[PDB]
Amino acid sequence: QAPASPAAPA
């Protein structure tokens, strides 16, 4: 359930 890297486009 780990979200994408915070440094990545959201």
């Epitope: 780990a2 979200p3 994408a4 890297s5 915070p6 440094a7 990545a8 486009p9």
Partner: antibody, heavy 120, light 112 residues
Framework: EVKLQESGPGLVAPSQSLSITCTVS????????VNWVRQPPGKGLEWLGM???????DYNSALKSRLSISKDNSKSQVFLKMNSLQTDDTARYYC??????????????WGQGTSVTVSS | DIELTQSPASLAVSLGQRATISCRAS??????????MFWYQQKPGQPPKLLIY???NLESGVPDRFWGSGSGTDFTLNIHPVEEEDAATYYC?????????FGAGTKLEIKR
Amino acid sequence: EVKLQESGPGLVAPSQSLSITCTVSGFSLTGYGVNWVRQPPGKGLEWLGMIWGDGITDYNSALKSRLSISKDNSKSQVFLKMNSLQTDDTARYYCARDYYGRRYYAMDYWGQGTSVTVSS
Amino acid sequence: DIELTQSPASLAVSLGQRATISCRASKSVSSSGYNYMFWYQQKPGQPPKLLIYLASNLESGVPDRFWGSGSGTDFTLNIHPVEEEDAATYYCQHSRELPLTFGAGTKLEIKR
């Protein structure tokens, strides 16, 4: 069968340009993002930038003014171009796929790399 | 810009004993209860190979002998028992903000 292979000149003169091509197979560039990472001989790893599936392109802020990253989904090619080359841009240049396409901004599959020296 | 300080720069360990490598971040690399921290092994003439993702998860096909731990700004890579084929340079990286940075690496010598 996931593969990536870098290709480029090997030698470039100072203040000139550098063009490298990363050729991929076993996956679509529409779904996975691809990074450029370089390693100066003797030293360690420096992240250059990333081009995601959708086309969003991220650069290392310290070199953004000299870097250009593009791709062609249909030909399975990712491109890097660097201007105003100085001697300490001498390194092995790698392309690495986004780890499992989960967007954790880590790397699973790398190419073997392409060596570049900057000298007249 | 986050810095990662890896220690020690080089390390010698005896076959069958334990190797402990440290990675210290200049800011927390935690978000939503996950630590955006990764470990690679680089042998000569080869590219780096991910062993650990998200601080503590073991990549499939990598032996039980490797494990990562830590959180916030203090992370560790442990090997036990150390084998001959573990002779390599180990690197940490984070993805908390941009740009992505790496540690300067830890070179592991195998004593015999």
